[model samples]
Target: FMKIFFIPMDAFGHVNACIGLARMLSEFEHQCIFAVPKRWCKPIEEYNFKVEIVKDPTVPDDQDLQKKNGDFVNRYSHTLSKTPREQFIELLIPSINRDIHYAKIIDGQIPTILESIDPDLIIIDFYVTLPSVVNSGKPWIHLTSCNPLNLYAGPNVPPSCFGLSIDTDPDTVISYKQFIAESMKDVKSDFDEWLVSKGVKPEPFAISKSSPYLNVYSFPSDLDYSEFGPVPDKCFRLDHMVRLVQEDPLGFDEKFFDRPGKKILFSLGSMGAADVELMKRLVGILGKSKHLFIVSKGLFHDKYELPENMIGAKFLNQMAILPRVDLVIHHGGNNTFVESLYFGKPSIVLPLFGDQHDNGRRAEDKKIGRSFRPHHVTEDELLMAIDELLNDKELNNRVLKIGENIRNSKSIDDFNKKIEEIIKVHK
Candidate 1:
């Protein structure tokens, strides 16, 4: 069996997807290890994979800059609360700071980690860059847990920053491209300088270019840009990379199962959970509803008292509770969106920022759900969306059919074969 290493960014969404892939690799008898931040070690430990902490120069081994980054971003602003195109530049705020820190200090950390492990193959999350991967001549593949539009930029496909609908105006598409080019100009230049300093040649930047061997997207084609013309030869899709977490019904309180009406689960993803205002508003809105409610309030769980029918928690095992819920209200994260669809539950997507708007738009376009702006959503608007989602009988059938189609697809096996070929070629 091959000794493989997986490196994921510190974000929960990114880490979760990489863990799913590592678990799959482990089942194939490969020895898999996750090189992760220390704060994330406990979560990765649950899978029983070998773990190595990425120590930072300033913070203790257990602390990370991302925690500070999240606090800064969440306190002043939310990622998903901006317009799709506007978000392109706005997101650069936190990312630029973090990336600069990496360029300055953490640039050589991964290479050092690689020296110790000497693994046969590497799988990298899209956001990570290790110039050492190129220098070492290791056979590596890149994995994206989010939308692929960010990876490929072409006139035929929709632009990276915005999640424009399939029937969007042609003029809007032109504007999107122009805006992205202007927004990326400075970031690109800075990134190139970082690469040069790291003793790696600066190349055209695109998520697809992360690895010479392969770039894998874990999202299905149905939710992709409708005109995603002429995919790259090295790029592949492994849509159903979600982990099969145990159905620990005990993970939730028994009282949750005994509630009155159709069960509804509301989660604002890890990042989205930072908005205390949004969480409070949600409780106020859904508290008046008849259905039993469960909210994963992230950082705001204990800050407010909940109605008798509702339960609030700092975190919940989403995979464990997804199937038991009749409908889901979420921040339109890739994990939550795909998992909801996988379980054939309709969703009302209240997007806050980033690719979430794109996912929300895709869901609305597909008729499996509807999208709304969290900042603008009144109690009535949310109630209406929930009613529409719950009553859409056709939506239920369509999502089930889509889930079945995903299950029948041999894409994951195809991805495994591609990895095998890459290893053979490397030899």
Candidate 2:
């Protein structure tokens, strides 16, 4: 009965989450228009949604997307070795610069897009806000694609990335929070300055806008920061926003699981797969293990060969294959984290950069999984962690319990109703 507009970041994790929400909403017979860049229109339209193309200033007329993305991943690949704060300081803008760049482009175009689409509500899945959405006088929602702690943390919570326990070290917790805020101060200024230059009067943006209507997160309540205290007002939590899965159609050897160990899905999302040296190192270590591995070999899939115990694909249907694996090695992506929990599977999160560090530490905090610095982790350390992850009954049981919580999550059926209610309120 209503049309909803989506402004999703191009990052796969964010895009997947946005699509999942829109897919669920479509089941209620609502229309969704994905306002995406040219490169993204086909991907979104493949889902049967309407696409309104937004201009991308970064893509040169002469380039193809593969080489373009190759250049992008390689440009920021070195940040994988830096600390979380270092990434926050140096890499945040460069990585998101494309989106932010085009955000300015869309900032001009969104007015007309809104007028033409006249959507009943708007959903933004990126980390920034735009005056166009605000000024349109339509109901809007902010769907945070990162962990919700990216949204709020107060006196006791140890900020997002450090992932420390508050009770034991309140002093360190507050200190870390202050230091984190201090670290982001410069980036925040730059971020706000750019927004103002684009004609948006920048308010307090943790690089995000707190929506007055609804702020949503895909994080499971089981691991949410509510254990400490209240989140920001107007907030809603969905255990997760995993999309409906279709059969992958891809097949493996008839007896591929014949290997004498647990089945492991070692997938480093597109970006992580770019760190070829690290992938080769991890692959070398995996060769010694008895476990059968299904590897989502990314950028350099052809650069290396899988061990006798493993199989490789440049990309795998992670959604369909998740349930078949006993264990997972992931890139600490938002969707992968919750999706792993969606199936109650324990995992090892190898976070390369961005909010990955936050999710990496979060896995440990929740006792659901373990995290390793993909580059710093030694072969023995990696194998031992896998053994520990596979053998720890408590850890396995904990994730299962969390998964049970996720399965019984708050309503998907009610989400569109909430949208309708908010739209009505604005109306």
Candidate 3:
């Protein structure tokens, strides 16, 4: 078999890393194909991969999801505020339905993957929900980009790892037995149903529970893992050390560095749409100080007006800009948080949804960074926090020193080796 299928999820960090892994594996003489929606093929093909569009009958194709899934996005947002169990389950049903929809797509695509493709191993991205069924007779590995898998998908840590509580240790607050019992309410039934459909009944995210086949946390371990517990035996920490190569049309450069005094970089990752009001509020805080840089993803050069010190761009070379910046004010995307840790910069994490809030709390509790509820962060509060993050020498020292340890601890070559080992054992 001269093939591997790189299943792509929606445009998220995990999907990007999985694609990157596939490309890296290809260099070792592996033949790979990116299985994705039709519209995504263009971008994936541009990356020079053979693309097979899954014309899923159950769900809208990638292009169609952008159009038809308006209600899904709305429900996802609404539940963030209302999060009662019933509301959550209401939110979950459509969400699972959507995944089921995509599972049908996988079923449609499997014939090709089995026949002409002859893939011996499938590197399923996080969103490929039917892996247990689809890869029943084949070797498949799952990619988890953030903390949710640890919370609901598998057994890794307490909700504290995801940044949920002010509690430094969630297990201490509630015993492991209690945590598992409570989680069973939110998990077991739905998870069992999905597993049953796949004809694979063990437990929720059983593979990850045993050990992640090889893991990539979009975070540096010091920010979260150092405080609460032992290093998970199977974790292969992938610090957000990715550099967008020079071939990028945007032409990344070190010139982004020329900032005076303390500079704060603010970003909210890629999921949220551009909110003009939020950008205005953030820029208002920056206007009071000269030592700030707001590298916001939502606001653009033309879309929103920016203050003299605040630079608004749809995209900034985060890897390029962090070296010059002193602190980060961001939406606590696991990748952004990890990138900040990679640079040894202090951060104020304001998570917008789901696992991000958990990540923010972990950062704050661990002392690598601090966190605030999104609603609680006011102009005065953000201004004061930035002052401390950029100037509080104690916090700055803590961040930089911990960053040194994290950087030395995990290397890309180590991650590559771990992947090879997992594939050998599982395949």
Candidate 4:
């Protein structure tokens, strides 16, 4: 039996969807191990997978994670105060630092774990700092919870795409591509030097050759890709896997879907936080007309004063909740957009960044949803769009039909076949 080791992410959404797929694969007799943060251990352990909480080597216990979180945020805030744009580059530092800090504990513990478990394969989420964990020479697969690395998508992609830019000009692709090529060259040179230091034959680009296993992105096949020309053949898509294993919700004294009002679920993807201004407007637009379940990154702390019809929470079982809702209002992340489509729920896409803006434009172009630019949208725009969709039977029917096709997605097995072929040829 092949043992597959996985590392979980800090939040829910696509990461959870990918982990659920991993769990399903494990149930078929493969072994699964998860290296997760402490806060995630309980939720992840519910699947019966072997879990290792990567504790900070500097701190003796998990409590230190909370303490460090505060320090990291404060330090980040202080730095932003001094030099403004520096914060943009450092947004990922604390998370990267946590992984690097945890990797030492992993490095120290792996020998015994490997000797006993002898994992044949390991899968890590995209957020993981890979360089810290590679010396073991174990086969490692990459599961990008969202899209692959784009420090920030240049002009065409919104800053919100990667959690950095709000600018959405399509005019910068050539320059952005050039900037990315330069970044790649510098990184490749450094990585080549490192490979030489390790006594491996240095390649022009070590990263592309360093791992035997490849990657998967959770993108719905029907979504537009014109914004990103031809990408690497190694990157694959497995977006609809979430629909296959959704069992009915099982726990709680109160059933959340028991209410009888027309429901709308609001989300900002996982990385895309809420737009307080837009959300406030939506709350007013839907006032007494629908029950609004708003899921925000920090749901409780938003500045908006919500109406009685609205309930805000940090998170929810979206698949379970989607079944109870008639509409989904979101910042267009690939996974969330696909999920919304799968449920045949109408959506209003208010994209702020990266592929999200592209996704919104494409979905709107396809007439699947009404897409609006958040910065420029007015209350009238939202209301009119809602009325247009709710009143149009043909669009609703087409969306549901497309959802049926999406629900019948065979991409995972298709991806597995391609992966096996690549491994066989390359290995």
> Best candidate, TM-score-wise?
1
For model 1, residues 1-427, the per-residue Cα lDDT tens digits are 7888887766777788888888887887888888776777777887888998776555556654245544655765664566666666767445655645653454467787788888888987746366766676789888888766666665555664466754778888887777766776776687767667767776664312468888887776566554655455578877667787842233357666866688899888875766777777778898878788888766545567778888767678788788888999998888888888778788898887667777888888878888888888889988888887787788888888877776676777777777888888888
Q: What ranking emerges by lDDT with the best candidate at the front?
A: 2, 1, 3, 4
| Stretches of model 1 off by over 4 angstroms after superposition | 57-70, 78-80, 99-105, 205-208, 246-252
| Native-to-model Cα distance after best TM-score fit, residue 155 in candidate 4, in Å | 17
TM-score of each: 0.92, 0.90, 0.75, 0.72
lDDT computed for candidate 1: 0.73
Q: What is the alpha-carbon lDDT of model 2 when measured against the actual structure?
A: 0.77
**Cα lDDT over the full model 3:** 0.58
**Model 3 poorest ten-residue lDDT run:** 243-252
Worst 10 residues of 2 by lDDT: 61-70
Higher-ranked by TM-score: 3 or 4: 3
**lDDT tens per residue, model 3, 251-340:** 233444565666677776654424444556666677887685756544232456767766656556566677777788787776677667
Clashing residue pairs for model 2:
none
The best candidate in terms of lDDT: 2
Score candidate 4 by TM-score against the native. 0.72
The 10 consecutive residues of candidate 1 with the worst lDDT sum are: 246-255
Question: 303 in model 1: Cα distance from truth in Å?
Answer: 2.1
